[PDB]
Enzyme design. Structure first.
Site, mmCIF file in Angstrom:
data_model
loop_
_atom_site.group_PDB
_atom_site.id
_atom_site.type_symbol
_atom_site.label_atom_id
_atom_site.label_comp_id
_atom_site.label_asym_id
_atom_site.label_seq_id
_atom_site.Cartn_x
_atom_site.Cartn_y
_atom_site.Cartn_z
ATOM 1 N N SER A 47 0.787 -1.329 0.006
ATOM 2 C CA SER A 47 -0.123 -0.112 -0.043
ATOM 3 C C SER A 47 0.860 1.195 -0.067
ATOM 4 O O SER A 47 0.179 2.208 -0.050
ATOM 5 C CB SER A 47 -1.107 0.121 1.358
ATOM 6 O OG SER A 47 -2.041 -0.976 0.723
ATOM 7 N N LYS A 211 2.776 6.591 5.154
ATOM 8 C CA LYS A 211 1.948 5.595 4.501
ATOM 9 C C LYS A 211 2.316 4.261 4.730
ATOM 10 O O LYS A 211 3.692 3.907 4.345
ATOM 11 C CB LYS A 211 1.671 5.677 2.879
ATOM 12 C CG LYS A 211 0.710 4.588 2.363
ATOM 13 C CD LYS A 211 -0.934 5.084 2.647
ATOM 14 C CE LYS A 211 -1.711 3.818 2.146
ATOM 15 N NZ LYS A 211 -1.383 2.717 3.232
ATOM 16 N N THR A 212 1.669 3.465 5.406
ATOM 17 C CA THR A 212 2.018 2.062 5.404
ATOM 18 C C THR A 212 1.763 1.024 4.151
ATOM 19 O O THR A 212 0.986 1.467 3.210
ATOM 20 C CB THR A 212 1.030 1.545 6.773
ATOM 21 O OG1 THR A 212 -0.171 1.488 6.359
ATOM 22 C CG2 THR A 212 1.419 2.227 7.922
ATOM 23 N N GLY A 213 2.593 -0.207 4.256
ATOM 24 C CA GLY A 213 1.896 -1.357 3.352
ATOM 25 C C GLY A 213 2.151 -2.385 4.387
ATOM 26 O O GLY A 213 2.994 -2.645 4.848
#
Length: 267
Positions: A47, A211-213
């Site tokens: 993501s 922003k994570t993923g």
């Protein structure tokens, strides 16, 4: 394992503590200097690409004055696992701008796919990346297939170094018009999914946008921009991890330790 993670004073110790593969770039935007760890190796964006999907929308909107206000239907059939904002809107519609916010701050997957339809898909996000000066990061698939990773398959990958440079150019630089870049920075600053990741290791002197993923195999990532609350030059910090021998929660602990080490490296 928890104790080893906490005692790691450098990125290699941290990678050893989790038996994983860690990729980090800590970039000083004032000098351009950066302190990396496997920063030129590919990792799956997962993501984290959503930061750049939203940037692609914002860039397109600079030449299309009605784009952000356009409404796109959300149907019950398009709802994916992890679609917390769009799920409330099934059977109605949402503005493009609100789909951008949702996909950044909650990582909403249905929102991301709808935005891909609006912007021209993985090729459009790739074109934005290339035009911005990133010939490394690349968008190829939609949710959820884009989260799949295999060594030697570069689809939907980036490197910690390329992504750090791109965050600088796009969130702080001149790739977007100032109002566009400010909107994107605000979304990152309002992220809700990263409280156990980089943020958990960074002190109050930083205003953080991130922003994570993640994927269902072994990947857990977090990319961030750090603005000093007292003023001064921002830093960019990208962290990509593969670590199948530890739990999902421990992967966040690794990312938090990346933040702790980084905060010490800055001062």
């Amino acid at each position: 394992t928890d104790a080893a993670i906490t005692a790691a004073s450098d990125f290699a110790a941290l990678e050893k503590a989790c038996a994983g593969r860690l990729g980090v770039t800590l970039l000083d935007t004032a000098s351009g200097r950066r302190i990396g760890h496997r920063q030129d190796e590919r990792f799956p964006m997962c993501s984290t690409f959503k930061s750049m999907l939203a940037a692609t929308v914002l860039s397109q909107a600079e030449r299309m004055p009605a784009l952000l206000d356009r409404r796109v239907p959300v149907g019950e059939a398009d709802l994916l696992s992890h679609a917390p904002v769009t799920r409330r809107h099934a059977g109605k519609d949402m503005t493009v701008r609100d789909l951008c916010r949702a996909t950044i701050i909650t990582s909403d997957n249905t929102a991301a796919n709808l935005l891909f339809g609006v912007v021209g898909g993985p090729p459009a996000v790739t074109a934005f990346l290339r035009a911005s000066g990133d010939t490394v990061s690349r968008s190829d698939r939609l949710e959820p297939e884009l989260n799949s990773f295999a060594k030697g398959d570069p689809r939907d990958t980036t490197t910690p170094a390329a992504m750090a440079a791109t965050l600088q150019r796009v969130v702080l630089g001149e790739v977007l018009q100032p109002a566009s870049r400010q909107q994107l920075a605000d979304w990152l600053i309002d992220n809700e999914t990263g409280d156990a990741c980089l943020r958990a290791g960074l002190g109050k002197r930083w205003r953080v946008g991130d922003k994570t993923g993640s994927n269902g195999e072994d990947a857990r990532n977090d990319i961030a921009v750090l603005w000093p609350v007292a003023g001064g030059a921002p830093w960019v910090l990208t962290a990509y991890l593969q670590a199948g021998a530890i739990s999902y929660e421990q992967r966040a602990s690794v990312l938090a330790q990346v933040g702790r080490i980084a905060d010490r490296l800055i001062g």
